[PDB]
Amino acid sequence: DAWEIPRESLRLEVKLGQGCFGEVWMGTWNGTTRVAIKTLKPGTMSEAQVMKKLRHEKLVQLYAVVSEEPIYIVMEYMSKGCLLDFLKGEMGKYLRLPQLVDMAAQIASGMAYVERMNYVHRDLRAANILVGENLVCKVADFGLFPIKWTAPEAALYGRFTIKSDVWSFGILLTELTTKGRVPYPGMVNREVLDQVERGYRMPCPPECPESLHDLMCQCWRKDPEERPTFEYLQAFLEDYFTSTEPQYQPGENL
Numbered sequence: 148d149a150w151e152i153p154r155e156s157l158r159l160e161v162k163l164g165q166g167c168f169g170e171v172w173m174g175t176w177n178g179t180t181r182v183a184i185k186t187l188k189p190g191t192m193s194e195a196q197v198m199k200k201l202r203h204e205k206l207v208q209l210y211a212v213v214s215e216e217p218i219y220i221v222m223e224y225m226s227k228g229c230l231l232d233f234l235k236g237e238m239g240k241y242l243r244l245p246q247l248v249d250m251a252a253q254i255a256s257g258m259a260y261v262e263r264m265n266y267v268h269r270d271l272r273a274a275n276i277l278v279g280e281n282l283v284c285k286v287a288d289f290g291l292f293p294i295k296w297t298a299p300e301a302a303l304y305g306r307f308t309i310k311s312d313v314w315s316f317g318i319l320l321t322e323l324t325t326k327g328r329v330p331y332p333g334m335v336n337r338e339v340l341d342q343v344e345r346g347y348r349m350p351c352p353p354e355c356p357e358s359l360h361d362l363m364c365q366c367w368r369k370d371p372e373e374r375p376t377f378e379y380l381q382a383f384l385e386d387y388f389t390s391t392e393p394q395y396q397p398g399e400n401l
């Protein structure tokens with residue numbers, strides 16, 4: 148493969164995190180290109196062909212690999228990290244509804260491409276979205292309980308579809324509109340399981356327009372196939388402030 152690279156071409160400069168499966172680093176590639184490098188611990192496992200052939204402006208791009216152990220994965224670099232941390236921290240404070248809805252439109256657009264390609268994400272949530280400069284957001288972490296973000300069919304009967312991802316997108320919309328709070332505040336996993344089965348849904352977060360909550364509630368319909376597509380979600384969010392909320396005026400937090 149042309150994607151396979153020499154081990155000397157990667158400088159691992161800054162350790163970013165460490166999870167169960169390995170590490171993540173900001174680095175350089177061929178001395179010129181900024182990159183993110185994920186490291187698989189040897190023993191953990193032994194798909195990037197898929198990821199080579201998943202190209203979209205709003206999906207973190209695979210750039211290069213090292214396929215014999217120890218494995219290194221080279222990727223597009225998203226400077227600001229986690230969408231969840233970005234929402235909670237010093238940048239949360241200034242984001243208003245137009246920035247957040249535009250962000251949601253990006254992630255919709257990445258998820259619309261995943262939809263066209265007949266793939267399933269399975270863990271769509273603010274923790275698995277990466278942010279770059281100028282509030283660019285991209286879907287990441289396709290190849291790996293978050294029951295609060297997981298549709299009932301999926302959590303209960305392992306029925307994971309693009310429509311279970313739509314459900315998670317409604318949940319993500321609440322994360323954006325609350326600056327990253329955990330959904331169902333004060334509820335534990337079983338409390339949530341039990342309540343959403345009985346018809347309970349998160350209410351309109353403070354300052355969030357009702358037209359948006361409405362969209363969230365379409366995403367949380369009992370029947371997977373009654374939920375909208377990502378092509379619909381994207382288009383609605385893109386056109387939001389002309390077609391749906393033309394009289395939006397700034398508030399204290401949204």
Ligand SMILES: */C=C\C(=O)Nc1cccc(Oc2nc(Nc3cc(C)[nH]n3)cc(N3CCN(C)CC3)n2)c1
Pocket residue numbers: 163164165171183185207222223224225226227228229230231232273274275277287
């Ligand atoms: C929400 C939890 C979470 O994801 N935290 C987190 C902890 C440690 C490391 C990371 O990865 C990480 N990645 C990037 N950029 C990246 C990864 C890939 C793949 N492509 N691009 C950036 C960052 N950060 C940079 C910004 N700082 C302020 C914090 C970490 N972290 C995620």
